[model samples]
Target: TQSVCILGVTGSIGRSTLKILGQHPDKYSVFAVSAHSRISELVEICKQFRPKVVVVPEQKIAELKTLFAQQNISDIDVLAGQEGLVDIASHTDVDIVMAAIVGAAGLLPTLAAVKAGKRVLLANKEALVMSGEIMMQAARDHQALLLPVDSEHNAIFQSLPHNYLQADRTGQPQLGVSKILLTASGGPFLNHSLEQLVHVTPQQAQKISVDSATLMNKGLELIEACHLFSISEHFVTVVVHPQSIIHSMVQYVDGSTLAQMGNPDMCTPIAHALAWPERLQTNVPALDLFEYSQLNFQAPDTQKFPALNLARQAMRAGGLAPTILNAANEIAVEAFLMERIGFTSIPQVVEHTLEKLENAAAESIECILDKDKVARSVAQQYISSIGG
Candidate 1:
């Protein structure tokens, strides 16, 4: 049985992964599960899966223990803080480490799992956004099987031939690939006017309704695709498809474009990553081509949503530039969520921070982290300065 350690067990990806794991008890076992602050849910999960180890954010450990005790569940070791995350990530028993934790905070433990040579099911795109070069190098040095859990990257992974040969596999001088087309849902603000967007709250914006309009998520995914695929910023492309049926696509030197399409469900890709090279049945909904006769595609309006362009610029700048971009975006998104910033100001904050850190180097993990810190501070400063 494959021993799996799932980070961020309470989040969307982690919960989806657990649902898939629940169906295949004969194939996989939960070695450890973790969450940021969802102690009660973690307690319930422990009651069901009974993982040997559980980790929670440092401050919540005492409450977590009480919850575990109240649930009358024992025998599971509970760990706290970032150190706990790293411990479970590098645990000797964990054969596959599902790095599902959100944002750059997930970077350290995810890298720890990779350094431990665990089969890494990477859903935490921000980790790559922060330090793709270092993470990729760690995977190489430790011989870790790093699998993409992002639907777009997973689609590309599934589309490529097993032994596909590129002219430059080393990623040093570049490759023969033409372009990678990353699809976007256009987010909830796709059709909103600048004036209309001015008053939209973060909760409304991130909701399914607004998320489908903004396309900020797509911008983040593009940042991820650049690093994961080892392609230059110029090679990456984004097309808005309202249907969300086409996850992503890639074009080759021979002018052939390959795409992966399925019902938009996290489980489909999660199950694919879990039992890679071996397809398994999943509870995820299947696609029906007949029901959807036409797939709509259009170029993202740079004027409407400039986050995509800003992301592309960050990718082109490379190194700590992407790290700064991610950090600033996260802070901006949080500010937007808190009603401290307007929806349109998300990109503004990111742009301001990016401009400040344009010359930064992303050569080392420490350097990238330093860039992240400085960028986030600057973003906060800007947010405060604007008083939005």
Candidate 2:
């Protein structure tokens, strides 16, 4: 049985992963799991999976341990803080590392797994969005297998030729692709007018919903596609698929388009990453063509959702620009979540932060992190200055 360590085992992705793993006990073993501050949930997961080790976010370790002890569970070991995440990520017993910790905070531990040469199933898009060059380089240096866990990227990965090489013979495998078409569900507000969006509260504007309507999630995924496939950002594209049944598609150099069809559950991709090169039965809901009458596709409104443009700019700027974009977006999203900012302010904050740090150089991990800090600070200032 392959031993898998799941980082951020309390989030949506983590919960989906645990459910999948729970169904396939004979094929995989849970080696370790980590959580930010959901000690109660983490402790419950520990009881269910009995992973060898569990890491709680820095300040929550003691509370997590107490919760575990109160439940009289003691077969597993508990680790604390960033160091704990790194340790479990690089643990010798682990065969696969699920890099699912959200945001830039996931960068280090995910990178640590790459450096350790473990099979890394990447769900944390921010890691690539922030430091794709560094993360990809580390994966190459360690000969680690890096598989994307996102639905769209996994679709592209599935569509690409397994070992096709580019004409230039850059010693890298290339898909005979014309373009990659990433599809978005357009969230809950795909039809909302700009004026209507301005008055929506954060509670009324869920991240997935806002991402769909504003196309920010697709924009971030576009950046992710550029880094993962080594494709130019220009060649990557997005289309609004309201049905969301067709997750994503890829066009070959010969003009044929291939797509992956599935019900929109993260577990499908997560399970794919865990088993990779091998298929396993998962409990994910299957896409039924009979039940769906129509699948819709449309071009994203660039004017209404400027996050797409911002992402393209970041990809072009390279270096630290993606880091700044991600950091600023994180802050903007947080502000929106806290109701401190309006829904429309998300892209504005990101735009302002990017403009402020357009020329910043991000040469190393430390530099990228420092730039991230600077961008977040600037984003907060933007939020304050706007009084949104």
Candidate 3:
């Protein structure tokens, strides 16, 4: 059985992974898990999966230990903080490290998993968005199998040939692969008017939910796809498919296009990544096309949601532009959630931050993180200047 370490075990993806692991007890085992703020959920997970080790933020370490004691749970070790997270991810016993932690915080630990040459199922798109260059290089240098876990990216991976990733795909034909058609759900506010968008509230959105509403989530994915698949932004097309049944599509040099269609469940992609090179069964049912009369597709309205275009420009600019875009968007989303800035101002904050910061080369982890901090400061100041 392959031993797995789950980072962000309380999140949707992590929970789904646990379900799949529970299903195939003969195939995989949970070795370790880490959670940021959900110590209670982590405890419940430990009760169910009985991971040997768990990691939580430093402040929660004592509380978690106390809870474990109260529950009569023993023999499970607890570690604290970022160092603990990195330790679990890179631990020698781990065969697979599910990099599910969100945002910039996941970057270092995800990189650690890659450097250890483990099979990394990457659900944390922000980590790739922030440091794709460094992470991809580490994967190559260490021979780590970095698999995409996002629904869209996973769908594309399924549609592509088995040998696609194994071959040298530099400035040449990638086995007749032509373009990547990234399908988007158009998010919660797809049809919201500009005025309606301005009035969106925190009750209506999480930071990610806000990103989906603003279409910035897809924008970040666009940058991620460019790095993951070794393709340029010019070749990636974002199509708005509200049904979300078709996760994504890949078009080839030939006239034909291939798509991965399934029921919209995280389990499908999670299972796919967890047992790659071999298929594993998931509880997710097959797509019932008989229930759906039709599926519709449309070109993204860049004028309505400028985040897509902004992301394209950032990817085109290269260097730390995408990093700046991600940092600025995180700050802008928080401000929008707080009702300090209008929803429309979200992209404005990102664009202005991109303009203010000089796009530098993403040379090292330290350099990228430093630029991320600088961009956040620039974005916050700009928000204040706008009367936020």
Candidate 4:
């Protein structure tokens, strides 16, 4: 049985993982699980998974232990803080590390897992988007398996040749792969005009029909594809597929484009990543083309969703640019959600930060982290002016 350690066991992706794991008892074992701030839910996950190790916010360790004891459970070792996360990530018993924690917070532990040479199921897109170069390098150097868990990237992975996953990966330079077609759902505001988007609220955009109308998520995926397959951003094309059925596609140099399709459920990709070089029966709803009537595709309107343009530009700049873009967007999205600024202001805030920060070589994690602080500070100052 493959031993699994889920990094963000209390989140949606984590739940999907648990759901799949529950169905197949003999195939995988729960090695360890972690949660940053969701102690109550993490306690429930512990009760269910019974992972050998549990990681939580350091301050809540005693409380979590009390809850576990109260549940009539014992023997599970409990650890706390980011250091706890790193420890389990590199723990020798874990055969598969599910890097599901969102945002920059996931970088270090996920990197630790990579450096430790574990099979990393990467759902933490920000980690790849921010530090793809170093993470991939570490995986290659350590002989770790970096598997894609994001629907689009996983779909592309499924569409590629069987041998696409290999131990000899080195920046994907010699592969026969051509352009990768990463699809987007166009989100709820796809048809909304620029004037209309200026008044979009966080509540309106919050429920991600899948990604967002801002298209920043798609841009992040574009950056991810470039890094994951070791392809160039210039060759990665983003197609607006409103149906969300065709997760993504891969085009070979021999005039053939392969696609992976499924209903908009996380289980398919999560199960796919968990059982790599094999398949599991998630039994999610099958894709019915007749019921949907038609699948549509078009070029992304970067004019309306300027977040897409800013994201692609950030990828081109590389280094601190992607990290700066991600940090500023997080703050901007929060501000818009809090009604401090209009939806159009999200991209505006990100652009201002990118323009302000000098793109530097974040060769080390310390350097990337330091640049993150500077970028976030720049974004906050701009938000003050815009809000006031």
Candidate 5:
């Protein structure tokens, strides 16, 4: 059985990890789990999984301690803050590190896991988007296995693992991969016109699929694919497919295309990554192609979802460009979620910040973080100006 640490144990991905782990008790064991703000949820998980350690945001440490005390649980260690995340990920005995922590916050600890040479099942796109060169470099230097867990990326992994695992420092494997075609569900606004999207409320926006409406998710995925496959952005393409049955695809130089299709549940890919080189069982429902009948595909409406184009431009720019893109997008989304800016203006804020922070560069974690902070500030300033 592999010993694993789930860095964002209360999240959708982390919850799925716990569920699948429960189904295969003999195959894996929980070594550590963490939550940033969901202490109550983490409390339940801790009791169920009985991990050796739990990590949380610094401010929530005391609350978590009290919760544990109330439950009469005293055996497990509680870790706090970034240091805690780093510690758990690099813990000597951990055999697998599920780097599911979201956003830029996930970068350092995920890197720690990779540097520690653990089987790092990476779900955090920011780790690769914001630090692709460095992260991939560390993985190669340390021989840490990076198994992508995003459904699309995982699908691509399945479609092209022969070269992916043994990929050169550039990230492209030996497979004659001519191109990568990432599938997108086109989100909630696939049919919503610009006028309709302009008024989307935060309640609706909370899905982050709202960002998918603007193709920012696909945009981010594009950057991630570049890093994960060691392929250029030009070699990756995004197609809007409403059915979402086909997670992703890879086209070979030999004029053949391979795709990994399944029901749109994360557990399937999570299971795939968890037991890589070996398949594990999951409760994930089977994909029924007959029912999914009409899988529609179309080119992304770059005019409607300018975020995609902006992200592509950032990919070309390289350096801290992606760092700026991610940081700015978060603040822009924050502003929009607060109704400070209209939904349509979210991309405006991000584009503005990227342009404002053009030429920013980051080759190290500290530098990336510094760039993130500065980008966030500028993004906030852009948001404020938009209001004015």
Candidate 6:
């Protein structure tokens, strides 16, 4: 049996990972888990899964302990903060690390897992966007299996030849793959005009959901795809598939396109990553073609959604450009969701931050962290200057 460490056990991806683990009890066990802002859910997960180690924000340790005592739970150890997260991620007992924590908060623990050479099922795009080179290099150096848990990236991984494992760092693969057709749902405002988008509200969106509306999520995913697959941004194409049935596709020079299709469920990708080179049964129902016959595809409107272009520019610029873009967008998206900034200002803030900061080579995690901080501060100042 393999022991898994779930870094974000209360998030959607984390919940799905738990579901699959519960399904295959004989094959897997939950060794450690972490959560933030959802200690109650974490307590319940602990009652069900009985993980040996639990990690939470340092401030929440007392609250979680009190919850555990009130629930009559015992025999589990709790650790605090990022230090705890890193400890659990790099634990010798862990065989897999589900790097599912969202946003910039996930980078450190995820990197710790990579450095420890655990099979990392990455659901955190910000980690790669901010430190793609470092993460991939660490994976290679430590022989850590970095698997994609995002449905689109997982689909691409599935569609690629088995020989993709042999590809070099940033070198073209000899797997007959010519291009990657990354699919996106085009989000809630796929057809919304530019004027309509400027007035979108926090009630209509989560940070990620707002990112989806702006297609900034796709742009971030594009940067992620480049690092994960060791491919260039030019070879990656984004298609707006409203249905989201076909998660993603891979194109070959031999005039063939292979796509991985399934019901739109996080469980599919989570299970796929958990059992690489093997298939695990999931609670997710199989896709039925007859019931959903029509599949539509269109080109992403970069004109309406300038975030995509900004992302592309960052990725093409290389080094810490994507880092700056992601940091700026995180702040901008949060400002937008707080109703302090307009939806259109999301891209504007990212663009302004990118222009304000000079691109630097992301040679070390410290440098990337420093740059991320500076970009966020710059974005926030821009927001304030605009009376946000």
The prediction achieving the highest lDDT against the true structure is 6
Rank the models by TM-score, top first: 3, 6, 4, 5, 2, 1
Error of 6 at 151 (Å): 1.0
For candidate 6, write residues 1-388 as lDDT tens digits. Answer: 9999999999888888888999899999999999997999999999999999999998999999999999999999999998999999999999999998886678889999999999999998877899999999999999999999988999999999976978665546456888999999998888888789877777776667888888999999999999999988888889999999999999998999999999888898888878988999887887999998999999988899999899889988999999999889989988987789888888999999999999999998889989999999999999999999
lDDT of 1 by residue, 103-191 (tens): 66788899999999999999977778788888887887898888899888898777665543232344321343577788888776666
Predicted candidate 2 versus true structure: per-residue lDDT over 1-388, tens digit per residue: 8899999988998999888899989988999998886788888888889999988866886787778779998878888888999999999999999988987678889999999999999988877888888887787789998899988899887777765312232323255677888888877677778888788776666555666556788888988888787778888788889888888898877778999889878888888878877887887777888888689999877777788999999888888888888888888888888888888889999999888775556567788889888999999999999995
User: What do the candidate models score in CA lDDT, each in turn?
Assistant: 0.81, 0.84, 0.90, 0.85, 0.86, 0.91
lDDT of 4 by residue, 100-119 (tens): 98877899999999999999
Cα lDDT tens digits, model 5, 1-388, are 8899999989999998999999988988999998897899899888888999999988998999999999988899988899999999999989999999987779889999999999999988888888988998898899999999998889989999465666554644355778889888887778777778787787765536666766898899899888887877877888888888888898988889999998878999999988988898877778887888778898888887888888888889999998898888888877776678887898898888888875656679999989889999999987887662
Report the lDDT of model 4 for residue 15. 89
**The CA-based lDDT of model 1 is what?**
0.81
lDDT score, residue 216, model 4?
88
What is the alpha-carbon RMSD of candidate 1 to the true structure? 2.7
RMSD of 3: 1.6
Residue 346 lDDT (model 3): 94
**Taking the tens digit of each residue's C-alpha lDDT, what string does model 3 give over 1-388?**
9999999999888989999999998999999999987788888899989999899998998889989999889999898889999999999999999999987789889999999999999998876788988888899999999999999999999988788888674633388888889999998777877778777777776777888988999999999988898888888999999998898999988877999988878999989988988999988987889996579898888988999999999998888999999999999999988889988899999999999999989988899989999999999999999999
Candidate with better TM-score, 5 vs 6: 6
- Arranged by lDDT with the best first, the candidates are 6, 3, 5, 4, 2, 1
Task: Give Cα distance to truth, residue 233, candidate 2, Å.
Answer: 0.9
Worst 10 residues of 6 by lDDT: 167-176
**Residue pairs with backbone overlap in model 6:** none
| Model 3 spans > 4 angstroms off | 171-173, 192-205
Clashes of each: 14, 0, 0, 0, 2, 0
